[PDB]
Structures are given as C-alpha cells and as structure tokens.
Curated annotation (Swiss-Prot), chain A:
Phosphorylated by casein kinase 2 (CK2) and protein kinase C (PKC). The modification Phosphothreonine is found at residue 169. The chain holds residues 13 to 302 of 441 of the full protein. This is Protein kinase C and casein kinase substrate in neurons protein 1. Residues 11-260 form a coiled coil. Changing residue 118 to E: Abolishes membrane tubulation. Keywords: Cell membrane, Cell projection, Coiled coil, Cytoplasm, Cytoplasmic vesicle, Endocytosis, Lipid-binding, Membrane, Phosphoprotein, SH3 domain, Synapse, Synaptosome.
Length: 290, 56, 291
C-alpha cells in the first residue's frame, strides 16, 4: 500500500527536504516582484508631483489657494518616500535574510543534489536494508510453500477420480500413492521454511522500527528549523509592508489638512485689489504748461 | 539556453520528463502560464518539466 | 498702467475667464491621480492571483501555507481600497467640480461667457462719464498750449524786426496788436482749462464709487469660487487618506493573526500521521493457501 512502512515509501520524507529549498527560492522571488510593484507606484506619484507643481506655479492661480493645492504634491512626494522604504526593506533586509539562511542550511554536491537530501537517503536506506532482504526472502518462501500445496492437491484429486477407475494395477499404482506421499513431505519442508523466515521477520521488527524512527526524527528537526525561521520572516515582511506600523503615514495627511485649513480667500482678494485693482496708484490730473 | 537540475523530479505522465538532481537539459522554449517548460535530456528523452526545479 | 486709467479694468475681467480654466486643471489633476491609484491596485490584484495559485498547488502545506497565503489577501484588500479612492475621486470629487462649473459659467453664442461679458459691460458704463470728461480735459489742454506757443512767436515777431529797417510804424503797431490778442487767447483758454480741471476733481469720487461697485461684484464672485475650492480640496484629502482608514488597520491586524497562528508542531504531527511512522501498516503473517 502507501504506508510509510512498506519498502521504499520513505521517499516522501526525503522529498520534503528538496521542497524546502525550492520554497525559499519561491518566497524570495515573490517578495522580489512585490518590491517592483511598490517601486512603480512611488515613481508614478513622484512624476505627478513634479508635473503638477510646474503646471500650477506657471500661473494663473495665485495666493494661499495655490499654496493649499500645492500641498497635495508634497503629500504625493512623502507617501512616495514611504513606499520606497517598503521596497528597500524588502530587498536589503528580508530577501537577504532568507538568502543567507538558505546558503547555510543547504550545501551542494558537484554531481548535482544537496548534502542534506542525500544524508536522509543513506540513513533511510541503511535502516531498511536488513528488512528489505528479509521481505524478498519471505515472498519467495511463500511462493515455494504455495507451489507445493497446489501440486500435492493435484496429486490428491488425481486419485479418487483416478485409481477407482481402470489401472489399479499394484505392480504400478502403489508407487502412485507414493507421489501423493512425496508431495506431503514437500509441503512440510517448504512450510517449515516459510515459518522460519516469518519468525525472523518478527524478531527484527523492533530494530527496523527503531532505526526508521531515528532518521524520521532527524528530518522533523530539520523541518522545524525551517518552519520556525519562515514564521519570523513573514512577520518581518508584514511589518515592512504596513505603512501604519508607525505614524509617519498619519502625519502626512495631518500636514496636508493644516495647509488647506491655512488658506484664506480674503487674503487672496485683498492682494489682488492692491496689485491689479483700485488699490493701485494713479497720477490724477493736475495743471500742465511748459 | 542550458539548464541545471536542482532537485530530483519523477514523471507524473508520459509527456512529463523525469531526471535526477545534477542532470542537465536543453530548454526548447519559454515557460507557459503555470511554470512548465519544454525540455530535452541527452539521447534523448523529450518532455515537459517545472522551471523552478532548475537554475543557471 | 493703473487700473484707474481708462481701460485698465481688463485684468479683473480676464480673472473671471481664468477661474473657469482653473476648474478644468483641477479635474485633470484629480483624474490623473485616479489613474495612478488604479494602476497600483491592478498590479496588486495580479500578484495576488499569480502567487495564490503557485502556492496552493505547490508543495507547501499546513499552517505555514496558510500564513504565506494570507499575504495574498492583504494584497487583495489593499487593492480594493485604492479602487475606492479612485471611485471617490471621479464619481464624487471630479463630478462636484464639473457640476459647480456648469452653474457658474454660461457660454454665449456671441462668444465667451455671459459672466465675463457682464463684468465688461458694468465697468464700461461706470466709466462712461469719466471717459467723456478726460477727452474734454485733453482738448482744453491742447487749445491752451497752442495759445501760448502762438504768443511766443508773436513776441519773437513784434520785437524781432523792431528798430530793424524792413518794417514800418503803421506796420509795427499791428505786430503789437498781434501779441496783444495772443495775450487774451492765453487768458480765456487758460480759464476754460482751469474750469474743466475743477469739474474733473469735483466728480472723481462718483467715478471711484461707481468703479468700486463693479469690482466688488467681481470680488464677490471670485470669492464664491475660492471658498468652493477650499471645500473640494478637503474632500480630496479625505478620500486619499488611508492612514486612518479602519479597513487599512484591519488588513494588517488580520495578516499578523494569520502569521502568529502558524504552528510548526501541528504541521509536524500531521505529516508524521499522514506520511510517516504514524501511518497504519499491515505486518506480515501466515497466509494459508487458497482457492
């Protein structure tokens, strides 16, 4: 069946070691693609900010409303910075951290594979060998034992519906019941052999179970180390993705509301009156000769 | 383009190639939507494999 | 130069047209920002889709798979929020300007806006009298200045051939009568010039009073706009601000819970049970011969 205890089925466990390395590559690339995404948003915000400052300042909008409107470009510049930081953390801290763990947990052979995958193969293989050899022995003896049963059986049937018929000549057929007899002794011999192997298997089962467990437990401890470390890395990442971990993000919009609240219509109005309105100076008529 | 196997991979289909870690293949094309590539071992088994089982 | 100079009200008028243009620039600005927010949301969605799949069919299992997969849900939620920012920007903020623009500025078949034209007419009228009176003041100044110039020549004439031979007594007395008539010219046209001057000074208040009213109406209009603008800027800031949006806080509360719930021992027990020495097994036993 698929039981772990059947010869060969330990490979699922060996395989989990190779899978762990791959999962590290997958995670690394995954965060890597997320940093591109964050970088792209920042840059677009940065361009808008640059674009609309130029477009606004170049007249005609004047006064504290230009100032209030332009405070928005600043918020685009500041949130842009925060998202660049998310990128810098993802790449310089989290990715490198996985990267270094990897190179220390998994060492590579010139052939191809990993030291660590190979080390669990050899442990499992070594622990199963006595067992496997006994299992080939058992199946053969069972075959041999059953082969005899079937035969001696034929010799049996080939007797009742046999002798009672024609040639029950003694000078011939007494040596016939001696075929059935010969089978008797044959089933016995093979039966005893089969039971012997079966007894061998019994007494070496504890050792088989002990040895396979020691290796399994080494594998679980290797995986636990991977799981504990990954958990800590996900946490590192969540912190970095979260612009609300601290309150710089909240200050951006507080700053923004203040700038808008500061702007006054009347000031913009009074200023126009002096530079373009009645407040402007004038040289009223007066007497003029040479 | 050349490709080097990172892990052992068992064929789960007739068009799904099999190899050992360390063995080397030839990429016949680019991945698809799922992560599968068309490849070829030496004289000369042809089949699909997963791209994340390979490096440079 | 000065606004009081006949004609120089044309910059208060222009200001009305500028207001219109501004509304448009505001809508363009907020539209482009909307697009930026939608692009980002769009990329987070596809990253979530892509990695959810690779993960779920991949070889990771148990609660570490769940924790990692919960990162795809933060991406999806953060995406949903930037779509609301975008929808708010266009469907509320943008629209509101548009509607306001519609009721404030009305086109005319004669070309331009009704509002601009009314300012121009109002000034022109409030300036009509004063324009008429500076013309007269000008004319008068002219007469008087030609009057002095002619007197100068009249003298450079009289006593210019005097004791000189080419000129006689009967003829000298006419040159004196000449300069004598210029003297009167100068005086009568000086008095007129002086007169107009007085009326101009006496009516300058009425001119100012009148020009002020039209300007005050233009100021009132310009104000309505600035006020509405300040209003629309606070609207936009609200819609942009995810820092104190409760759903934004929830996404990362949820993410941290998912991660902190990953339990290595539970994953180990499960694997031991379904793939290792914990699995059931049928140990060999004596097997009798069938059929």
């Amino acid at each position: 069946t698929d039981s772990f205890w059947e010869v060969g089925n330990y490979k699922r466990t060996v395989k989990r070691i190779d899978d762990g390395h791959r999962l590290c590559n997958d995670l690394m690339s995954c965060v890597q693609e997320r940093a591109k995404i964050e970088k792209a948003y920042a840059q677009q915000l940065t361009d808008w900010a640059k674009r609309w400052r130029q477009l606004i300042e170049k007249g005609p909008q004047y006064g504290s409303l230009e100032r209030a409107w332009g405070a928005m470009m600043t918020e685009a510049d500041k949130v842009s910075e925060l998202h660049q930081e998310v990128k810098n953390s993802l790449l310089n801290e989290d990715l490198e951290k996985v990267k270094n763990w990897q190179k220390d947990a998994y060492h590579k052979q010139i052939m191809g594979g990993f030291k660590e995958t190979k080390e669990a193969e050899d442990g499992f293989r070594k622990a199963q060998k006595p067992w496997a050899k006994k299992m080939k022995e058992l199946e053969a003896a069972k075959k041999a034992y059953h082969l005899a049963c079937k035969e001696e059986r034929l010799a049996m049937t080939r007797e009742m519906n046999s002798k009672t018929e024609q040639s029950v000549t003694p000078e011939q057929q007494k040596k016939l019941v001696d075929k059935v007899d010969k089978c008797r002794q044959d089933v016995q011999k093979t039966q005893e052999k089969y039971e012997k192997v079966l007894e061998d298997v019994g007494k070496t089962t504890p050792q088989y179970m002990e040895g396979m467990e020691q290796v399994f437990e080494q594998c679980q401890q290797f995986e636990e180390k991977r799981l504990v470390f990954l958990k800590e890395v996900l946490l590192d990442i969540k912190r970095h993705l979260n612009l609300a971990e601290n309150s710089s993000y909240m200050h951006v919009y507080r700053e923004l509301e203040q700038a808008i609240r500061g702007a006054d219509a009347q000031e913009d109005l009074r200023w126009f009156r002096s530079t373009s309105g009645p407040g402007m100076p004038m040289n009223w008529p007066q007497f003029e000769e040479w | 383009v050349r490709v080097r196997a990172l892990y052992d991979y068992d064929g789960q289909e007739q068009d799904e190639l099999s190899f050992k870690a360390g063995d080397e293949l030839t990429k016949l094309g680019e991945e698809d939507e799922q992560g599968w590539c068309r490849g070829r071992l030496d004289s000369g088994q042809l089949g699909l494999y997963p791209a994340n089982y390979v490096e440079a």
